[PDB]
Amino acid sequence: TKQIIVTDSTSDLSKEYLEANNIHVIPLSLTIEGASYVDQVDITSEEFINHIENDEDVKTSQPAIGEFISAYEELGKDGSEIISIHLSSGLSGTYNTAYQASQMVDANVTVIDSKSISFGLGYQIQHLVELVKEGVSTSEIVKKLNHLRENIKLFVVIGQLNQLIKGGRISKIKPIGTLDDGRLELVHNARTQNSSIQYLKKEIAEFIGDHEIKSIGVAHANVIEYVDKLKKVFNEAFHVNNYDINVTTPVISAHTGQGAIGLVVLKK
Ligand SMILES: CCCCCCCC/C=C\CCCCCCCC(=O)O
């Protein structure tokens, strides 16, 4: 009776969490100097960083449609519904490909465009896990996640602007972007790591008003010291109880550059 959850490799949730909650991941790939690697299957994050530091060209790719078709038909084998939630259609063709696959299987699959990435997607997955445990219908789940998204704010501080430009995801010093209905918009330029954090503090204070923070996540492109600077400021400003912190997946850092951070705040 419980729906089965599928996602892609861009949520930045821990492997322990994904495995513990039976979340099936369809991974994206990277092409580095003419050779491709499935993220976290054929290449580790340490290995990826070594390629980047060697000035190598990197591109990313959505999963092949056949990977979705195979997964959906197998997971649906006993008649269970599948809910397949993906990073923003404004950032990747993954969602569209999942939808196409859903029209080519006998299984019953509902595909959701999260309009987000990293913990913005991850927190939707975590809420989805809870709704499935509670027995909520798929149609109601879709509506509830739409409401939840209005309470998520995502910022990214770009590590290497030239990488972001090469990757093509811009829809509209340290550049700072946000997602606007799933599309990446650069909204501010900060002069330093420290000043970027002051900007983010003020923007988060504006976003939350007198609301509590339910979850706060920071994903980072191999720069924990920058994350720690943010935690120190945010601990004083907002008295955060716990952060979700992870090294971001190579598919994301391929676009942001090394030294980037992604801040995600879910308000109550
Ligand atoms: C450092 C962690 C940052 C987390 C927030 C990222 C916000 C969006 C900004 C840039 C990342 C873009 C990733 C695009 C992946 C495309 C995959 C594909 O090839 O289809």
From Swiss-Prot:
Hexadecanoate binds at residues 60, 92. GO terms for molecular function: lipid binding. Keywords: Lipid-binding. Residues 3-267 form the DegV domain. Transmembrane segments: none annotated. Gene3D superfamilies: 3.30.1180.10, 3.40.50.10170. It holds the Pfam family DegV. The keyword Zinc does not apply. It comes from the Bacteria. The keyword Plastid does not apply. May bind long-chain fatty acids, such as palmitate, and may play a role in lipid transport or fatty acid metabolism. This is DegV domain-containing protein MW1315. It comes from Staphylococcus aureus (strain MW2).
